[PDB]
Amino acid sequence: QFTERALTILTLAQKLASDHQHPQLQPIHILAAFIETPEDGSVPYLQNLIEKGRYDYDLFKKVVNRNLVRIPQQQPAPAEITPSYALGKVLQDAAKIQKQQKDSFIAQDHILFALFNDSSIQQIFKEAQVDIEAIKQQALELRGNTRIDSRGADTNTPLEYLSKYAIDMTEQARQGKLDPVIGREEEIRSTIRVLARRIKSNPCLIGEPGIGKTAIIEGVAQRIIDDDVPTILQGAKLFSLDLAALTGDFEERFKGVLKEIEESKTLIVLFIDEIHMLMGNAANILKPALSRGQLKVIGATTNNEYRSIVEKDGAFERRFQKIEVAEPSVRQTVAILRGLQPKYEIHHGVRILDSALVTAAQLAKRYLPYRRLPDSALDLVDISCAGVAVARDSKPEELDSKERQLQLIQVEIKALERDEDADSTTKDRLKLARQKEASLQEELEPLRQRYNSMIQNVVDSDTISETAARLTGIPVKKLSESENEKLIHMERDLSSEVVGQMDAIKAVSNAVRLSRSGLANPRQPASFLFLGLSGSGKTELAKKVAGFLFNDEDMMIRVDCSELSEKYAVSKLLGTTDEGGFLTNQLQYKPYSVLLFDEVEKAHPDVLTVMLQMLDDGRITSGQGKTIDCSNCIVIMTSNLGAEFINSQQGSKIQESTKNLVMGAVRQHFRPEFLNRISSIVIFNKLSRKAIHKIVDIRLKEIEERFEQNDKHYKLNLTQEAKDFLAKYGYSDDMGARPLNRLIQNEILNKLALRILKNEIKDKETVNV
Amino acid sequence: QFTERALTILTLAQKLASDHQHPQLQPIHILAAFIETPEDGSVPYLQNLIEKGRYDYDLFKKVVNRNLVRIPQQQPAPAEITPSYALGKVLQDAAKIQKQQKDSFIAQDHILFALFNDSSIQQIFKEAQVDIEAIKQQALELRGNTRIDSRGADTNTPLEYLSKYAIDMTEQARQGKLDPVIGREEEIRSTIRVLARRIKSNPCLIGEPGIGKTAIIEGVAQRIIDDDVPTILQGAKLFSLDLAALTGDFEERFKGVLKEIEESKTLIVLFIDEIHMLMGAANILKPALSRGQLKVIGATTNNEYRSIVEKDGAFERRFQKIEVAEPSVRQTVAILRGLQPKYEIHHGVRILDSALVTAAQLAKRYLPYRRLPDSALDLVDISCAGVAVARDSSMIQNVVDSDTISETAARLTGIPVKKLSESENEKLIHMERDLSSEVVGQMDAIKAVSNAVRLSRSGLANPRQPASFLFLGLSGSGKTELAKKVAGFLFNDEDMMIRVDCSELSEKYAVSKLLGTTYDEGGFLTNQLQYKPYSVLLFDEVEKAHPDVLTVMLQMLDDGRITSGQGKTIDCSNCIVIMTSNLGAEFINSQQGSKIQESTKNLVMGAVRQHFRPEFLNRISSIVIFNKLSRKAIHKIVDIRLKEIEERFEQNDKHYKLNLTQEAKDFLAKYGYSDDMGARPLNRLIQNEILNKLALRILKNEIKDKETVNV
Ligand SMILES: Nc1ncnc2c1ncn2[C@@H]1O[C@H](COP(=O)(O)OP(=O)(O)NP(=O)(O)O)[C@@H](O)[C@H]1O
Ligand SMILES: Nc1ncnc2c1ncn2[C@@H]1O[C@H](COP(=O)(O)OP(=O)(O)NP(=O)(O)O)[C@@H](O)[C@H]1O
Ligand SMILES: Nc1ncnc2c1ncn2[C@@H]1O[C@H](COP(=O)(O)OP(=O)(O)NP(=O)(O)O)[C@@H](O)[C@H]1O
Ligand SMILES: Nc1ncnc2c1ncn2[C@@H]1O[C@H](COP(=O)(O)OP(=O)(O)NP(=O)(O)O)[C@@H](O)[C@H]1O
């Protein structure tokens, strides 16, 4: 029976016979129904069955232009009020070729197929078209199996199906649309290598999103249109799925392509993005036909996505090769960074300095966990591009904002200036707010000098820096010193925190360099187990550590063994059975990071055994199966074991002696393998007033941080006795004045807050004990 | 007036007859002027209502200039000098179809329409313009309502129903029709920035709505049409969808609109607004966006991100998310003073910052809920309303602090006088004695906690981290009230206190407290804080509370802003979190002999010190034993009771005066203190041996009203 789009074909010739009011359904109605518009966009029109198969239709188009118009006038109701069995025998008569394409029901060409019998102008010049086979011929010769039922434009497009969802960039290659690629070359060649196997030509590409997996396909095709596509392979071209909404459940559509491309005679390839579809329920789709052994297909993924269906299946594995895509090198980046370097700056109407370009690739490489320098660099770049190119675009937004920066404060002081009042009046406030606009007054003439944008080239710095500042912050560290001088001065830097343990610090400062230069295996943690008490820097140190190292407090990550006596491989994120992502998340949130474990001395067979992997390889597996870099991660361990011996530090015990004395204890608590990935273990020993009162002062230093800093400007007084009193009552042998630290506020802040409440403190008014 | 678009042709039709310098303007002229070239950029060719209505113009493209070259040539001034009312009627004659097809001005169809008589090949073979046949036919095909104004873009299927559901604000921009948002360019800084990425132009305002999110998009369109957007962006334009939702299912129009715009020369960026949605979609509105095209902007809460962006991440791969931050005071004060002139004249009044900031101040505290600037305005509006309501039934138009604050505040809540009164200073200072009210003794926490919480406020420590309390005593000592006292003191409410018993909390209760959608409930914890961001949390048997608990308690201990299970994170700090343990009941035996607290405290802590990850402990502001009754309490506890006597009763309700023997103190005080339960049981008793013993006189009237008796 007819296609609904034949019906839609019918709709038009009718709609024609409706709008153009033809009183009956005649032979020649359906050409306008056929032809979309003078385009060949109808399978009947030019690229059509007709013109190439036997005779040109554009002629029999050109002439029927009148035939359409030679229809007589009608009045409103009667136009085409009849099915016109004279025409309408095709209701039955079109059944000729409907199935003979190996199909279900009748189609455009196929209703037309019976029209060479029915609809035609068969005359001195016979206007009847491709004659005996030629239609059916070209019905097959163009697509063929062109339709099934009612669905999709009846003999849609110039050919048939596919081309809607068939997407070829060899075109875009030969159209130049495609980015050149780098460095996946033999990788492609390996993908290319996949392709010869009568067993499996079908790759799967394992690795991070955004890595270029699709952009990979460029060079794939690029080298294909380069005819670096080899012999067997040359015949194919680019095709891959652009996931279409099925628009009940229409995967038949998506079944449609299958034999279509199968019939299509290996002229193209199939690539599939990521979900290679595992429906929660559609299950096998194409899979057996996919399993047939024709149908070249490309897979791509990262680990767990791969881990999704095939682990069930294995037939994909049985039907594919999985191929990791390594996150490309920074210079791979740097290189192909330059690829669209000209592009995006011209996309963004600007210029670039590779200085930044490498610089991000330098810097950003560390600092975006999720996205990938394989892109994110560029992503920074477009980012780098825009705002500055925006600082070019509408004018600088800075110019455009410098009108806004005053814009309210000029009209907000209105209410201040509306009526004189006893509070906000012109005594101070109306003059006070005048300083902001005065601070905003001085840019204009110096800045208007610039344009009346010039920066076109990306700055190195801000394009990283300011953007990094946009991205994270504290540029000054990210600004200049890289990897290095931090080290030399690290200790003396870290010497801030608590003196003593300096060697350990040195060892740390050592081990971090062990953590660098790659001498020590660049796949390996930085393994740190610490001895001491509360207050002692298991307490503390990590605070400085990443703050030094990663410049953060929170790369430091908290873990308590006390929590974990038995199963926490359960909540480690076990294999989903309820989502334990924490540990994973902890990195999965935070890759360049510092790992504090608490109660480590109590670490239970579970937690320790993954510590081994943590100890291992600088990588961390998941329960879901993902493995995750520990190398750039720093590990931190509370150990109070020799607390005895720690307490014995009353004697200020010979450290190593008491260390040895300790060692057995920890030596007991831990298998050597643990012990033998440990890059160091150190006490955090006795404290000197020298230390103490400074450490005391250390918080005293930072009191301001909000207070005199981001709020009060309070001018600080302390009596040295108090400064000693701090130690004196406050310092706890075992726990330090860290307890007193919690107290501090009481004897300090509230004591002030009291005055604050009082107002005997006005700003800088200060009286202490 | 004629349509510009029409007149664009019309004068160009006058220009048409001018180029060949025609002698006269005559019917078949503009048949050339309607068409630059066969492109649908000239609709009269194909997209014309005639080619679809009656006469296709393809070959009929042939004849138009054939006449206008065969017009007798003229010289410049007589060219376009005449309407030649035969044609000159088309000026008026174009106004005929605006009737039957319902239009107002004279449009491209209309200028066309009038022509339908002689503008043509009119012969035995007539290739011409049918009169009503092509247009009223296809003037619905085209459009279906054509008429807007002489102004505007093409009047022939420009996306298909371009406006059919997305207003152009760049209209109102170019029209200057919206109060330009303020402090918003740094947002815009994102936007334009967000844009030029060939990867993702796609901004998303992500976070609790109601800040006036897309209001920000104003300047966008403005600075679009201000030319304050850059060259990449200047061709683009800004519309905002209006959902036409009906029913097969029109959302293919929601697809069709797509087929408009990127196919429209991507000449816009549509702003999608608040819900960007897998229908509770698949590929809808993605595919061309997904095509790496379709420059477009959505926004929503985190939650939908937290919902839908959890479903894909290609959205993340489609979009750049952008956080939204409800303005602080001045950040608000902008929109305040920005909109201060506005609704005062909108709602017909006038304003002072007097209330304005204060509203912002007070409301943002005391309005619990929404985005202050909104609500502040909303307040202000309704503040401005009630006064305007008060005004015309008008000694004021301008509005000041007080009722605009307070009544309105009261109209929100109540007790202006407090909210009126204090900047917390006295509430800081004299609270000493004032807090001292409820609990005799335990001046320590009284001293401390107040002073402490005084220090908890002022922000001299983490701006985000709350006032943190775990307490010691016996439940029944008034501490709980003391909270409610102090909350009621501070927060001007008891309900600030919130009840979750650690006894109710076993292990998996971390569910029932709160949860990631799935039951699906407002995290009960939040759900009240979510309701009431300024509040108090006293949770006891903390000892039972299972350290599974404390992690959020930690968060709650921490940082003063607290996630939901769905993740929504909200201020802890402006609520106060309180705990007790019963541990020291043993050690209480010391203070049962009133014995040295610190001594036993030292003893005491070890207990609690044994019970927790230290951090838990180590957040708390302080922890305090609450001593058992000295007589001082009792008679005051009596006074308390005495106070809750007279509440409504000894006058407004009962009107019965009350005297007491010292027995009436002592007879209680005899049984006053339960060991465990203190006066708490007794506090029930006056109900009985007194009130219900008075029910004697009461239930009868037996001795008269206003009497005063004891036992
Ligand atoms: N080797 C490359 N050559 C050219 N462009 C590249 C290359 N790698 C990445 N890109 C660009 O990166 C952008 C998209 O990266 P993409 O190829 O999607 O990474 P991906 O790992 O393939 N993510 P996806 O394939 O979508 O799952 C496009 O603009 C590409 O042009
Ligand atoms: N090595 C140190 N570096 C910095 N601050 C230190 C150090 N030792 C003591 N302090 C002081 O202690 C404060 C922080 O103590 P903190 O590290 O939080 O204890 P903790 O984290 O609870 N760990 P713990 O003592 O083992 O229970 C700092 O602000 C300093 O005033
Ligand atoms: N900077 C600003 N200046 C002035 N008015 C503003 C500003 N920001 C927001 N608004 C107001 O915010 C109100 C709401 O705008 P809108 O952007 O839709 O809010 P919203 O946060 O998006 N709420 P919703 O649309 O439900 O998500 C408007 O009345 C604007 O006037
Ligand atoms: N010194 C006091 N000041 C104020 N109220 C007190 C005092 N001593 C006891 N109370 C009363 O003790 C009762 C409850 O004390 P409270 O602090 O609420 O413990 P609790 O947590 O409520 N235990 P419970 O009453 O069983 O729920 C209230 O009726 C208070 O009035």
Curated annotation (Swiss-Prot), chain A:
ATP 1 binds at residues 207-214. Changing residue 213 to T: Abolishes substrate binding. Unable to confer thermotolerance. Reduces ATP hydrolysis by 98%. Completely abolishes ATPase activity. Its main location: cytoplasm. Residues 1-145 form the Clp R domain. Signal peptide: none annotated. The keyword Oxidoreductase does not apply. SUPFAM superfamilies: Double Clp-N motif, P-loop containing nucleoside triphosphate hydrolases. Changing residue 319 to M: Reduces ATPase activity by 80%. Impairs oligomerization. Has 2 AAA ATPase type nucleotide-binding domains (NBDs) per monomer, a low-affinity, high-turnover site (NBD1) and a high-affinity site (NBD2) with a 300-fold slower rate of hydrolysis. There is allosteric regulation between the 2 sites. ATP binding to NBD1 triggers binding of polypeptides and stimulates ATP hydrolysis at NBD2. Nucleotide binding to NBD2 is crucial for oligomerization. Belongs to the ClpA/ClpB family. This is Heat shock protein 104. The gene is HSP104.
